[PDB]
Every structure is written in C-alpha cells, then in structure tokens.
Amino acid sequence: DSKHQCVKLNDGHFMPVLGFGTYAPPEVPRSKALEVTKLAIEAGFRHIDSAHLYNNEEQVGLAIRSKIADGSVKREDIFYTSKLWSTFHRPELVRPALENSLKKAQLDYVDLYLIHSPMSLKPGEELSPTDENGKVIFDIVDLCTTWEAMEKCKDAGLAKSIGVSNFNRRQLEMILNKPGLKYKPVCNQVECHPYFNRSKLLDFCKSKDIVLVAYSALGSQRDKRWVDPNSPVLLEDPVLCALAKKHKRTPALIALRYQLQRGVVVLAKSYNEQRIRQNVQVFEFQLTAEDMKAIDGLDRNLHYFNSDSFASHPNYPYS
Numbered sequence: 177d178s179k180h181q182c183v184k185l186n187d188g189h190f191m192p193v194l195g196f197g198t199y200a201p202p203e204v205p206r207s208k209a210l211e212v213t214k215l216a217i218e219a220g221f222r223h224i225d226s227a228h229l230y231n232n233e234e235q236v237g238l239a240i241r242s243k244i245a246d247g248s249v250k251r252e253d254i255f256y257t258s259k260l261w262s263t264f265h266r267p268e269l270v271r272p273a274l275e276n277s278l279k280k281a282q283l284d285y286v287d288l289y290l291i292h293s294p295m296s297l298k299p300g301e302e303l304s305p306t307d308e309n310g311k312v313i314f315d316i317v318d319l320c321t322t323w324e325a326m327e328k329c330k331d332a333g334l335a336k337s338i339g340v341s342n343f344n345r346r347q348l349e350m351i352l353n354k355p356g357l358k359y360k361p362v363c364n365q366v367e368c369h370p371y372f373n374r375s376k377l378l379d380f381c382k383s384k385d386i387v388l389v390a391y392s393a394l395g396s397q398r399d400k401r402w403v404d405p406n407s408p409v410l411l412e413d414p415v416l417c418a419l420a421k422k423h424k425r426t427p428a429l430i431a432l433r434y435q436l437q438r439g440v441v442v443l444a445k446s447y448n449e450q451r452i453r454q455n456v457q458v459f460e461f462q463l464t465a466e467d468m469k470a471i472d473g474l475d476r477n478l479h480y481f482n483s484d485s486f487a488s489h490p491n492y493p494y495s
C-alpha cells in the first residue's frame with residue numbers, strides 16, 4: 177500500500193516515511209498516550225516516535241502490545257524509535273539507558289535509537305539537572321565516544337539502526353570523520369517545516385545517504401516554556417492555506433506532503449482521533465512542482481524552540 181511507503185536506510189533497514197509523534201506536555205495524563213498510540217496504529221501509522229524524555233515509553237509500548245494482541249499488526253510491522261537522553265551521553269551510560277527504555281516499553285529491540293541532542297547535561301537521575309540558581313547544568317562529552325557506545329548497541333541487536341537528532345553539519349561531520357567508524361548514522365532528526373526548511377542540511381545529508389527526519393513539521397505545539405507567542409502560526413500561513421483550498425485538503429496535509437516530496441521523512445503529532453486519521457491522507461494527493469517552489473519560498477530561519485538555556489550550551493546546533 178502507498179500508506180506503507182518506506183525509505184531504505186544506509187544500513188539496509190527500512191523506515192516508513194510517515195511517523196507518529198508521541199510527545200505531549202506533562203500536564204497531559206499518561207493515559208492519553210496509550211489511547212492515541214492505539215488510534216494511530218488503527219489509522220495506519222507504523223512508524224512511532226518516542227524517547228526516554230517523553231515519560232511515555234511504557235504507554236507507547238503498551239499500545240503496541242495491545243495492537244499486536246488483537247491481530248492488527250505484528251511486531252515486525254512496527255518501526256519503533258527511542259532516544260538517548262542528554263544526561264546519558266557518557267559512554268558507560270548508553271547501553272543501560274537503552275535497556276531501561278526496552279524494559280519500560282517491554283520490547284526486545286528498538287528499530288531506531290537516536291542521540292536525542294548534542295547538548296550534553298550533567299549525568300544523574302534528574303532529566304533536567306539544575307544548579308542553585310535554577311540554570312540547567314551542562315556536561316562536556318566527546319560525542320564520538322557516545323557514538324561508539326551506540327554502535328555497540330546495534331551490534332548487540334538492541335537497536336536495528338542508530339542515528340542522531342538535532343545535529344548540525346559540523347557535528348555530523350565529526351561522527352562521519354571519526355577514525356574507525358563502524359556505522360554511519362542512518363538519520364538526523366531535526367526541526368523542519370516551511371518556515372525552517374533546512375535545505376542546506378538536507379542537501380548535506382542527501383550527499384551522505386543520511387535521511388533527514390522532520391519534527392515540528394506542523395509548526396510545533398507552541399509550548400509556552402520555549403516558543404515565543406508572537407511567532408507566526410505555521411498552519412495559518414496564507415500560502416499554505418491557499419494551497420489547502422486549491423487541493424481541497426488542509427494546511428497540515430500540505431505541510432506534511434511538502435516534506436514527502438522533497439525526500440524528508442516526516443513526523444506528525446496529534447492526540448485527536450480525527451486529526452490522526454486525517455494525517456494519513458497525506459498519501460492521497462500530490463503537490464505540483466509550482467506548489468513546491470511556492471512553499472520553498474516560505475523559509476524564515478524560524479526555529480520555534482528558542483531559549484537562552486539552549487543557546488548558551490557549547491554544543492548548541494544553531495547560530
């Protein structure tokens with residue numbers, strides 16, 4: 177089926193080009209992640225994006241287990257992604273972090289394990305370690321050694337594929353130029369949308385056989401902790417809205433289809449049954465070449481996540 181279209185990764189594995197985003201803010205009860213991940217699988221999502229940080233791998237794993245038990249899907253039909261959180265970058269912490277995620281989700285392996293971010297944080301139990309003055313505490317880790325620990329996780333069969341997230345070109349090149357590299361990252365999961373389309377990074381990744389995976393492809397959830405309320409709302413963009421009317425679709429569907437036609441694997445978060453099912457209709461239509469150029473013109477270099485807690489980190493990927 178067209179809905180189960182995949183891209184071949186540089187390690188031979190396959191990744192579905194449309195993925196379900198599972199992050200919800202901590203004020204959303206965890207029971208919802210369980211309910212909506214089941215809804216996503218029912219609608220035809222097979223790529224599910226989670227992370228230790230999201231405090232939901234148990235619920236996402238329960239949803240997968242439930243849909244396997246009622247015969248909707250086999251484990252082999254699901255592409256499950258987890259992410260190493262930034263307090264676990266030190267190489268001796270990597271494999272135990274992955275094994276803990278597997279235990280929470282009650283899975284035997286992940287299809288994809290990512291370094292969540294290059295911005296290392298102080299090791300410990302707290303996900304957001306902070307000093308007496310409230311500032312998040314940074315750590316300094318050679319991410320090449322983190323990657324070597326990820327490579328051992330793939331060789332152990334705990335992760336079918338490994339990749340990175342929120343890396344810029346310089347940080348990617350550091351991994352790719354590493355002496356004795358065994359596995360290249362299969363992907364780089366980054367913020368990517370018509371207001372921040374990452375064409376330069378996309379061209380770099382294409383030249384290296386690295387898939388760019390787009391998050392916040394619908395403009396982010398605009399969480400007040402990190403998103404400026406005065407930033408423009410992506411789905412209210414006049415060009416996207418006119419394209420939605422011309423195609424008799426929605427602005428969200430235009431934004432998702434834009435990514436598929438430029439070779440980007442796209443994530444979409446929804447906790448609403450009707451929008452979850454609408455988002456799978458991205459395979460039903462096509463943007464013209466002129467439509468694509470129009471959307472290409474919307475780039476504003478706008479990353480919705482903006483905070484001096486990020487920007488002061490030595491490994492902050494933007495500039």
Ligand SMILES: NC(=O)c1ccc[n+]([C@@H]2O[C@H](COP(=O)([O-])OP(=O)(O)OC[C@H]3O[C@@H](n4cnc5c(N)ncnc54)[C@H](OP(=O)(O)O)[C@@H]3O)[C@@H](O)[C@H]2O)c1
Nearest residue numbers: 197198199391392393394395396397428444445446447451
């Ligand atoms: N690697 C990283 O650092 C990183 C960072 C950010 C995100 N991610 C991952 O990418 C996923 C998606 O990114 P995101 O969380 O920023 O959200 P997003 O995909 O950009 O979606 C933002 C909002 O769009 C709404 N939406 C979904 N479908 C819609 C539709 N058809 N029409 C209108 N609105 C629609 C959703 O609200 P409703 O729920 O109300 O439908 C959602 O809250 C995340 O959940 C996470 O899995 C990863």
Ligand SMILES: CC[C@@H](C(=O)O)c1ccc(-c2ccc(C)c(F)c2)c(C(F)(F)F)c1
Nearest residue numbers: 199227229292293342481482486492493494
């Ligand atoms: C809270 C949602 C969560 C998710 O859904 O993954 C998320 C969202 C954005 C970022 C983020 C922000 C700024 C910069 C520069 C970055 F590189 C990554 C992170 C990260 F990586 F910092 F943890 C995590």
